[PDB]
Design a binder for this molecule. Structure first.
Ligand SMILES: *CC(=O)Nc1ccccc1Oc1nc(Nc2ccc(N3CCN(C)CC3)cc2)ncc1Cl
Length: 273
């Protein structure tokens, strides 16, 4: 659609290259002043666009960004292993859809929690795109190599590590972006997670492979994640309990998960033994 700007009522700035919450036809909306075949539940919908000032009109995500949920200002919300696996399943479903786009695949290129928006009490995730991103970028990208949709698989793997640990990836490296690029180019990866279930560890590290052809397709991730949710009930629970979270010491190349996998091991055991 081609929206009339006067029909919109701007409100508070949301992000700042500036995004603001607004009403348009009694519908809450996000707008942004200085592709259309995309229709998926896990991708922020583009309603239309105005002409002067030229601006995008998109659905509004009331929950803010995943990054904000994970690492934002106190008070931070509690969340569970089911939430973590659900966010990543929903992210892979949105991204699989982009990769299936005809006649040419759409690669996100910038998959990272600051661009993953939440709604429905923090339970539904939606990919947003307008394109310190080094931390989620596949090495072939910033070495100027020819990349493919496998670069998004790499980013997803980092995100999976991130929601399970509630840690910023490569937070210990710091300095400018080039230090992380150098690190990851040389094979450094986020530390392994104590007690992580072997199937999730297998999936995560595969996604981190240096060789992009050794990473799984997104369609494979979606399917694997779909079937693992049988062991992660509770993803529909709205985020609503308070959390006081503090970084446990992290050395020995081994960090503790923030989420708890005891119930996964219990439900797995019922099925298998
Ligand atoms: C695609 C993208 O990067 N989107 C995006 C990033 C940052 C801000 C806004 C963006 O677009 C956007 N945002 C939203 N909803 C939303 C709601 C609240 C917030 N807050 C919550 C409190 N914080 C302190 C930070 C911001 C951020 C974003 N809906 C849709 C769209 Cl397109």
């Amino acid at each position: 659609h081609m929206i009339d700007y006067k029909e919109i009522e701007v409100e508070e700035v949301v992000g700042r290259g500036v995004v603001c919450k607004a009403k348009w036809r009694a519908k809450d909306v996000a707008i942004k002043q200085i592709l259309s075949r995309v229709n998926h539940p896990n991708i922020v919908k583009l309603y239309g666009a105005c002409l002067n000032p030229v601006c995008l009109v998109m659905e509004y995500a009331e929950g803010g960004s995943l990054y904000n949920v994970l690492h934002g200002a106190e008070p931070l919300p509690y969340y569970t292993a089911a939430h973590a696996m659900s966010w990543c399943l929903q992210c892979s479903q949105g991204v699989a859809y982009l990769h299936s786009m005809q006649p040419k695949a759409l690669i996100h290129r910038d998959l990272k929690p600051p661009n993953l928006l939440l709604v429905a009490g923090g339970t539904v995730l939606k990919i947003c795109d307008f394109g310190g991103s080094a931390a989620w970028m596949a090495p072939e990208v910033f070495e100027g190599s020819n990349y493919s949709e496998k670069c998004d698989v790499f980013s997803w793997g980092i995100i999976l590590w991130e929601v399970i640990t509630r840690r910023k990836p490569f937070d210990e490296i710091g300095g400018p972006a080039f230090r992380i690029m150098w690190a990851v180019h040389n094979g450094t990866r986020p530390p392994l997670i104590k007690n992580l279930p072997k199937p999730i560890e297998s999936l995560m590290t595969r996604c981190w492979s240096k060789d992009p052809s050794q990473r799984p397709s997104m369609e494979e991730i979606v399917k694997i994640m779909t079937h693992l949710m049988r062991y992660f009930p509770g993803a529909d629970e709205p985020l609503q309990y308070p959390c006081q979270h503090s970084l446990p010491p992290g050395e020995d190349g081994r960090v503790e998960p923030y989420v708890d996998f005891a119930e996964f091991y219990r439900l797995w055991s019922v099925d298998h033994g």
